[PDB]
Amino acid sequence: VLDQYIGSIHSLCKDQHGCRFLQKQLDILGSKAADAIFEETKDYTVELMTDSFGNYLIQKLLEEVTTEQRIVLTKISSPHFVEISLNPHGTRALQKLIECIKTDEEAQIVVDSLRPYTVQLSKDLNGNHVIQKCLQRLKPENFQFIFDAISDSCIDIATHRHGCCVLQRCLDHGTTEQCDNLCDKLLALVDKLTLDPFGNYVVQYIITKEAEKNKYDYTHKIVHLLKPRAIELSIHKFGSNVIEKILKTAIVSEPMILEILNNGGETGIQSLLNDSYGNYVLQTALDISHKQNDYLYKRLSEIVAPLLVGPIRNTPHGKRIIGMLHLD
RNA sequence: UGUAUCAUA
């Protein structure tokens, strides 16, 4: 019921020892000191959220603070979200606010003031981690803005470094109607996303998720568009990782190994053999068929063995594939 | 022999 720091709360946020102090005097102290700290910081929220330590205190406050205090404190940050998102310290408190958000007003406020910055923030080191929180916390009805914002700039965000790490939380917390409209789009860029240094990490994710819900919708729509030309995407730094995934998911593993033999031929196996990225596709197609299908391992081996002769046997990828010929 | 991110005192 008594505070020695009253009238000097703001000066306790300029240094760290004070931020931990108030946080300490906020947990085991009740709401009495929640109205205290709030009232003497509200005029500095935006400033405190982006401080080296201020952010920590703001997050702490957001918890004990009552609804009305938040709704207020949100309407204060609302026109500063963008500069707070783009901030390494601000991105933290802004997320913590998106966490403690309860009422459906704090929601309509946050969504409205992020909506026209969605794309830009996702492409940001700290801006995306906030857009990731909206999916991780809000209702499907609420974070719909993200999906709407992201479904007009698919490749822009997917092929972008941090843009794809956000797409991964779309597929995680989205609606079966949403993800199955986001993927409708992604699928139309599966050519360029598989080759791209970041887009490929998303294609691997569409599959990853469906293989987690044991409900395969696009995993097949992917394979139907990535199989006809599988040797080409195999001898490629990034496409090779997408093909290893299809090769590592049972429900499709086989028919893909089966494309390396059908159209691939003893030729394609050579192309896989010598390439620095293909020799991993070939090397995986072995380990897998070996376990899943002894008629594939057998038809794979009776082509590989004839070609493991001479200079190859003395290469890094050569010695590795040699070890995978007869282990059944 | 070959890819991101997983991040504030």
Swiss-Prot record:
Coiled coil: none
PUM-HD domain segment(s): 1-328
Protein's GO biological process: negative regulation of translation; nuclear-transcribed mRNA catabolic process, deadenylation-dependent decay; post-transcriptional regulation of gene expression; protein localization
Keyword annotations: Phosphoprotein, Repeat, Transcription, Transcription regulation
Entry GO MF terms: mRNA binding
The Pumilio repeat ranges on this chain: 4-39, 40-75, 76-112, 113-148, 149-184, 185-224, 225-262, 264-302
Gene Ontology cellular-component annotations: cytoplasm
Note: Present with 721 molecules/cell in log phase SD medium.
Function: Is not essential for haploid growth, but may affect diploid formation.
Name of the featured protein: Pumilio homology domain family member 4
